[PDB]
Design a protein around this ligand. Structure first.
Ligand code: ITE
Ligand code: ITE
Ligand code: CL
Ligand code: CL
Ligand code: ZN
Ligand code: ZN
Lengths: 369, 369
């Protein structure tokens, strides 16, 4: 049988790595992209379609689910995997990031966050919710420091997150079934400040986690600054564990993050922007609603192997999106998630073959032409 | 190769018949239910999923499509079959029924109907639009008489429809490619009046059509009256051609209409009411939004063979519909269309075995228990 958790690196090029995470519910090829499941569904896709695109793992948002149906109810019904019909690994978020963005009112304290959608979300309760959902990769409960942040506020915030990381570790370890079958990732904070990023990495490594996320990025700083922070931050994390960049991102963000040592990604961009009419192609994104596509018989992308590009034209999908048809959302989403998975496959293959630097240059030349 | 059109009756029980229509693009098993494609899509389903439910033919609404993308544009793009990815027969409506229900302003004359969505829809233009879409079964352009109607108004309306039926026949026959590859159905009018229904049937048979629809029903008269009109109206039509009841209907409407000699049906009920949360079951319809389903781990229906009932619970679908999730619409629609196809299969098999009367009684006892 597969282990609870084993990350193996098969090939490297510069800071980039490719390999596998083996878990009880399946193998994850890295670098990996996780489609996002909000409210127990990857929007507009059956799980079998998600799998057909090549996804090995999905991210399950916890915020909506902890309110409706509720984590206890999902547990009573057999857990999130059974409920939604996805039998492979699920990484769950802690619920706190979306509490801060989606709740009407919030109150912060050392204990946790209280909010009205009143509820308290503490590290202990977050870990319990993720347990009740049956998460395979559990995220420590943290605070995403806003950008920009003063050094004083970034330090205070990071220090609280590190106290919360230790509470998350102890809560996870206290629950035998969770400790034996799931993995726990810690989240580095420190805003854009190298010394705080180092303190955070040191604190997380002392606690010890199965993987390490770079938090606090993709929150308004822009790509140049994100990459500058990654340049010094990723090397601070243990080399032999996965590195997860939360909430990233656009295709070029992913490529550059892999060049800086990131192994895992999630983002709503392919799903949400697909429903809004944006299709990803090797020649850059297109907006299928544009009148220029009304008689275009080509597929969304000329090379894409996905089922949408085998069967339907730009003209048809243009018509569907303009008309507000559900099938438009379905087809755009399947193609965009397939594009993201094909990007990850090209990244993995190029690292394995020692030609990732060339792939990154070729990718950018064509995508931004 | 298959013929342009051949209807064969394999078995009969009372007025009920079962058999096949062979056309160039495929075989249609009768009695048949046609899922409705609005704006070139059966809402929330890929065509392969429509086919997986057992559908042999779909109804393509023409009203939206003649406005956007436009019939000429669809023809330029290769026709409706290629555009939407359904390669089997399509019956197209004439566009007039929805002009009357969906247009802002309408003006009626002997030439046709002018409307603002300004456009003129005549019998000749309707037949041309259906040609440009690449229809397999073309409907004559008629007027659905409102209910109730006085005898005078029902007669005047029916007489106009019969003049329009002859114009539709001549337009269809004038276009060699259409006459050679498609079929044309005429539509009986006459409201609830036996003498007018007879005059209409006589006029249609004198013109000659490949199939005959019963028009002017399912417009507010209720089941008892609909069945009373069918009792005398269907025997007036040629026995050796298909009989199509337009816009019907609920499962019990279909069963009773087959008992009265109807071979073909279409309705938005399974698709539209599915998206709204109504699921059909052998024990009657259920509203999946009801709180009683929040922890119900059973499938939508206990016997249904569809993919939705193999894989997902009532509780999950309840959650999806409550949450407004696209997957909720997808799953409800697939199940409901599969239910309708299973109903038609049970009807066909029971007629073939000489036990349809018993099936109808058993169906009603359980569905209305
Ligand atoms: C879309 N950008 C973005 N999504 C994020 C989610 C996060 N969760 C926990 N902690 C984070 O710091 C964090 C940062 C993030 N940036
Ligand atoms: C939903 N009920 C219903 N949909 C109909 C469509 C029709 N089209 C043409 N002509 C008709 O008489 C006619 C009657 C109908 N009743
Ligand atoms: Cl999304
Ligand atoms: Cl519909
Ligand atoms: Zn594609
Ligand atoms: Zn079913």
């Amino acid at each position: 049988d597969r282990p609870r958790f084993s990350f193996s690196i098969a090939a490297r090029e510069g800071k980039a790595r490719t390999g596998t995470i083996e878990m009880k519910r399946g193998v994850i090829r890295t670098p990996a992209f996780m489609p996002v499941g909000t409210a127990a569904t990857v929007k507009a896709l059956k799980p079998e379609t998600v799998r057909a695109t090549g996804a090995d793992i999905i991210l399950g948002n916890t915020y909506h689910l902890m309110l409706r149906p509720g984590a206890e109810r999902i547990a009573k019904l057999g857990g999130l995997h059974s409920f939604m019909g996805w039998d492979r690994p699920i990484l769950t978020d802690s619920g706190g990031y979306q509490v801060m963005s989606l709740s009407s009112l919030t109150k912060q304290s050392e204990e946790g966050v209280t909010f009205k959608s009143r509820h308290m979300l503490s590290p202990e309760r977050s870990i319990e919710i993720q347990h009740l959902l049956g998460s395979d990769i559990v995220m420590a409960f943290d605070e995403c420091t806003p950008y920009p942040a003063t050094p004083s506020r970034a330090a205070s915030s990071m220090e609280r997150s590190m106290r919360w990381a230790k509470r998350s570790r102890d809560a996870f370890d206290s629950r035998k079934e969770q400790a034996e079958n799931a993995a726990l990732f810690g989240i580095q904070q420190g805003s854009v400040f190298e010394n705080l990023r180092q303190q955070s990495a040191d604190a997380l490594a002392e606690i010890g986690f199965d993987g390490y996320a770079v938090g606090g990025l993709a929150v308004g700083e822009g790509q140049d600054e994100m990459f500058r922070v990654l340049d010094f931050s990723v090397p601070m994390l243990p080399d032999d564990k996965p590195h997860y960049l939360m909430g990233v991102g656009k295709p070029d963000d992913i490529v550059g993050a892999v060049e800086r040592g990131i192994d895992m990604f999630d983002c709503v961009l392919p799903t949400r922007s697909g429903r809004n009419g944006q299709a990803f192609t090797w020649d850059g994104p297109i907006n299928i609603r544009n009148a220029r596509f009304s008689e275009d018989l080509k597929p969304l992308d000329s090379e894409c192997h996905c089922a949408v590009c085998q069967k339907w034209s730009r003209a048809y999908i243009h018509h569907l999106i303009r008309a507000g048809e559900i099938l438009g959302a379905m087809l755009m989403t399947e193609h965009n998630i397939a594009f993201y998975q094909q990007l990850m496959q090209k990244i993995r293959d190029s690292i394995s073959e020692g030609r990732f630097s060339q792939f990154a240059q070729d990718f950018r030349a064509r995508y931004f032409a």
